[PDB]
Amino acid sequence: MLNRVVLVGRLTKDPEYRTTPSGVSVATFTLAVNRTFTNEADFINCVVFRRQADNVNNYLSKGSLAGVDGRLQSRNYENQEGRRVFVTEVVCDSVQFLE
Amino acid sequence: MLNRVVLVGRLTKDPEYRTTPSGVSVATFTLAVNRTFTNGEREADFINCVVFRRQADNVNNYLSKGSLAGVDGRLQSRNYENQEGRRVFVTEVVCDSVQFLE
Ligand SMILES: O=c1[nH]cc(F)c(=O)[nH]1
């Protein structure tokens, strides 16, 4: 079914590397996406698969402007405090490096 | 900045329909959005949506568990403390429009 999300925002921190529970490598970063209206940003976790993870970790850093096109994915997991965390993330088909 | 979400899916439950403390209609539901790829089995994503005003009224009046719907909106994050004292991070789709597809 149709699942498409597009964002332009600035990274809140330097991107990271991580391995999925199944051992697949990804890059992760958080995008601060300023709203168009007035009463503020939204903070959206993004996930890049395969070698695109290397472009993300080398070209972007905290404050970099980026654009993402991808799909929204839900998952959940138990954190270290033994707590069930529910997340909705953008799994990126492409990341555009705007600056 | 650019922030756009489009989804087609089916409601996992009857929408929840209420009037906020500002006086606006509010509707919430979870859209089960099937993935295009397959594992052979095909998995789904479960996206929390919220709609306000006339679109909320329409959602309550026409959508029910299992209904096919299309949403066009924006992705919003927020924070809250639960009664256990834990910070909970919320990501949901705030719908500008809902399309009824059945
Ligand atoms: O962050 C993630 N994105 C997609 C996945 F399939 C997963 O396991 N973890």
Residue numbers in the entry:
A (entry chain A): 1 to 39, 45 to 104
B (entry chain B): 1 to 39, 42 to 104
What text comes from the article?
Single-stranded DNA-binding proteins (SSBs) play a crucial role in DNA metabolism by binding and stabilizing single-stranded DNA (ssDNA) intermediates. The majority of SSBs adopt homotetrameric configurations for activity. Diverging from E. coli, which harbors a solitary SSB variant (EcSSB), certain bacteria like Staphylococcus aureus exhibit a more complex scenario with the presence of three paralogous SSBs, specifically referred to as SaSsbA, SaSsbB, and SaSsbC.
The individual monomer within this complexed SaSsbA revealed the characteristic OB-fold structure, featuring a β-barrel comprising 5 β-strands capped with an α-helix. Within this complex structure of a SaSsbA dimer, a single glycerol molecule and one 5-FU molecule were encapsulated. The positioning of this glycerol molecule, designated as Glycerol 3, within the SaSsbA–5-FU complex closely mirrored that of Glycerol 1 within the glycerol-bound SaSsbA. Residues R18, P21, V52, F54, Q78, R80, E94, and V96, positioned within a contact distance of <4 Å, were instrumental in the binding of 5-FU. Based on interactions discerned via PLIP, the four side chains of R18, Q78, R80, and E94 were observed to form hydrogen bonds with 5-FU. The electrostatic potential surface of the SaSsbA complexed with 5-FU unveiled that 5-FU effectively occupied the groove within SaSsbA, a site significant for single-stranded DNA binding. The positive (blue) and negative (red) charge distributions underscored that several critical basic residues on the SaSsbA surface, which are exposed to the solvent and collectively form a binding pathway conducive for accommodating ssDNA binding ssDNA (gold). This complex structure insightfully revealed that the presence of 5-FU in the groove potentially influences the wrapping of ssDNA by SaSsbA. However, intriguingly, our complexed structure revealed distinct 5-FU binding configurations for SaSsbA and SaSsbB.
